């Protein structure tokens, strides 16, 4: 007899297959969603810190390149804004430093060389550019630009090693899907991220039919951002639309919803000057109050849910805060286990 | 500058003298098509998105959101290979004509080639084909070292596996590219996208030869007619449609009242006379290519049919569903 070569093999494949559908049902897919620059990536990063393999010296170096990258992007946007808000430079020499930095190959940055340090430091000193930074609420610019740019010092030195904080802030250009697996001792979690998808959602959204959980994210600091090029669109009114559409999907019925209200530390910092009312006429409460504003924002967002039966479990978060998340997430953990154990 | 666009509309109109309907009319229609399930491929644990036949018309690959890609013995039933994919978010598979490699991609934007019959432990990740900024729509080899790919980021790309490099990029689409199909000779491919219009491309030269409008919505499926001078398109607008390259225009629309669900897949029959399509309403449909009649149906799935596959010897059909099942029809 000469047969059953891969017939006998097919037996042992169903063996592995059943063991792997067995393990994978215990995986809890937690889909991160929310607009641009609203905290998802950072969250994932925090998970690797509290519940995962950390960022050891080696792991860190792999970011050095990205640190540089951000800076240029940060500066690059800043430069555009100048010619959009019609703000000129205080110092003449800097206009050359702009052309210099304009032509910078968005992505090709190996090291952070001397001619580029000055170019950028020079500009960071220009009272036009700082004024542009002071009006970042119009156009879109990363929220930790100041962080790095007030540190050009260390970032540009030869023997430079980044640290957790830098790590927690670099824009890490996402090819497409970001999935991260980890576990609370007995249970395994699998975070999901699709922010860096340069395509239409309506062709792949259904790939997420009844996942364990949805974690939706709003930036609180977002309330007063408008984007003049993008025709004065309120950046948080924008996020309200994503969420409304996200919250009406049939795909997500069985999926528990969590609303992270992120960039809170940035909220009450700024709620003292910018006023919530003259951006959302309906706002009724006091001024110069974080708590009143959080509660309000959390309401317009929850209001977008059509039907009693589906409870949203929100939290207030600072995604840069390692101990905040460490403590916020335990709550989520429970309200997921307690809620999906039946 | 743009009424030059309103010039091919005179060209294709002067080319129109008779319809494909008018001509295929006094010819007798199709005999009778009622295929029954010849096999049920059972092994995936979540919904399957793509499948592709081997050139031997017997072995085939699947691609399921279960993070497992599977090679099947279609005649028998036996699983030959199971691929533990790094990303369970896959959206297509490929079968090398040689059957030495197998490609697959998805929301990762990495076209993963897999070295099949080997002397390695089991089956290894061979190449990383990275360069796309959106989900991997579909893919099919030209040989063991070149593959055309189409993706969400509105572009299709021809690669060189050996070196893993972007050989030539085929840009021209507005909406996402959903589909692709090589011509018989692999001299030039057709690709359907969410611009509601497919494109005929020249493989080596790069540039887009002909653009084809028609559908009032998203194409998800495209298909080269056996001889290589026509193609089928499967769209959300619920119509299948026919285009001749040499005529440079639509010849047939496989509409139908009372059906309104989208179409995920299309694949012709050896002769070209049958258009097998796969639908949202869990039903596959068998179309008279020439007459525009609805011959039969492959009703047999519980969820929508995500992909089709017709054999090279045209004696069998695979259908792939979101119900984690494949069925062979005869």
């Amino acid at each position: 007899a000469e047969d059953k070569a891969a017939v006998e093999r097919s037996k042992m494949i169903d063996r592995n297959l059943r063991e792997d559908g067995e393990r994978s049902r215990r995986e809890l897919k937690l889909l991160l969603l929310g607009t641009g620059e609203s905290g998802k990536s950072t969250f994932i990063k925090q998970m690797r810190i509290i519940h995962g393999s950390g960022y050891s010296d080696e792991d860190k170096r792999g970011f050095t390149k990205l640190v540089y990258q951000n800076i240029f992007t940060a500066m690059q946007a800043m430069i555009r804004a100048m010619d959009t808000l019609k703000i000129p430079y205080k110092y003449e020499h800097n206009k050359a430093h702009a052309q210099l930095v304009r032509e910078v190959d968005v992505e090709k940055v190996s090291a952070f060389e001397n001619p580029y340090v000055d170019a950028i430091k020079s500009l960071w000193n220009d009272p036009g550019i700082q004024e542009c930074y002071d009006r970042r609420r119009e156009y879109q610019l990363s929220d930790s630009t100041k962080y790095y740019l007030n540190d050009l010092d260390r970032v540009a030195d030869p023997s430079y090693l980044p640290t957790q904080q830098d790590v927690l802030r670099v824009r890490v250009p996402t090819t497409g899907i970001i999935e991260y697996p980890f576990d609370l001792q007995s249970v395994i979690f699998r975070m999901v991220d699709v922010g860096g998808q340069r395509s239409e959602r309506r062709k792949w959204i259904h790939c997420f039919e009844n996942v364990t959980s949805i974690m939706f994210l709003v930036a609180l600091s977002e309330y007063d951002q408008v984007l003049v090029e993008s025709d004065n669109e309120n950046r948080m009114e924008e996020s309200k639309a994503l969420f409304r559409t996200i919250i009406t999907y049939p795909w997500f019925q069985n999926s528990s919803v969590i609303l992270f209200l992120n960039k809170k530390d940035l909220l009450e910092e700024k709620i003292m000057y910018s006023h919530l009312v003259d951006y959302f006429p309906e706002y009724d409460g006091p001024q110069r109050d974080a708590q009143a504003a959080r509660e309000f924002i959390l309401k317009m967002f929850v209001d977008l849910n059509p039907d009693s039966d589906k409870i949203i479990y929100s939290h207030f978060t600072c995604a840069t805060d390692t101990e905040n998340i460490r403590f916020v997430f335990a709550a989520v953990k429970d309200t997921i286990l307690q809620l999906n154990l039946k | 500058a743009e009424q030059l666009k309103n010039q091919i509309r005179d060209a294709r109109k002067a080319c129109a003298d008779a319809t494909l309907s008018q001509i295929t009319n006094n010819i007798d229609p199709v005999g009778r098509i009622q295929m029954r399930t010849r096999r049920t491929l059972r092994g995936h644990l979540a919904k399957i998105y793509a499948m592709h036949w081997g050139t031997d018309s017997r072995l085939l690959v699947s691609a399921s959101q279960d993070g497992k890609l599977i090679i099947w013995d279609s005649y028998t039933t036996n699983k030959v290979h199971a691929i533990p994919l790094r990303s369970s978010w896959v959206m297509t598979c490929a079968y090398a004509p040689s059957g030495n490699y197998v490609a697959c991609g998805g929301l990762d934007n990495i076209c993963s080639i897999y070295n099949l019959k080997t002397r390695e432990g089991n089956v290894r990740v061979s190449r990383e084909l990275a360069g796309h900024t959106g989900y991997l729509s579909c893919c099919r080899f030209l040989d063991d070292n070149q593959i055309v790919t189409s993706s969400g980021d509105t572009t299709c790309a021809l690669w060189d596996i050996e070196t893993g490099q972007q050989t030539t990029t085929f840009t021209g689409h507005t909406g996402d590219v959903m589909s692709l199909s090589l011509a018989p000779d692999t001299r030039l491919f057709v690709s359907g996208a969410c611009d509601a219009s497919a494109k005929l491309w020249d493989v080596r030269e790069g540039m887009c030869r002909q653009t084809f409008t028609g559908h009032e919505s998203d194409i998800n499926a495209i298909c080269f007619f056996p001889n290589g001078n026509a193609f089928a398109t499967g769209s959300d607008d619920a119509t299948c449609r026919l285009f001749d390259l040499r005529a440079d225009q639509e010849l047939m629309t496989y509409s139908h009242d009372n059906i309104i669900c989208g179409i995920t897949s299309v694949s012709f029959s050896k002769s070209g006379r049958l258009l097998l399509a796969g639908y949202d309403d869990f039903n596959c449909n068998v179309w008279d290519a020439l007459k525009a009649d609805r011959a039969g149906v492959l009703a047999g799935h519980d969820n929508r049919v995500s992909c089709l596959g017709v054999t090279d010897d045209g004696m069998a059909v695979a259908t792939g569903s979101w119900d984690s099942f494949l069925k062979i029809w005869n």
Binding site: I44, K45, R48, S53, Y55, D59, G62, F63, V172, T174, T175, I177, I178, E179, Y180, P181 | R86, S87, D108
Partner: peptide, 8 residues
């Protein structure tokens, strides 16, 4: 998945 991250 990246780029480490995930793992990586």
């Amino acid at each position: 998945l990246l780029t480490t991250x995930x793992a990586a």
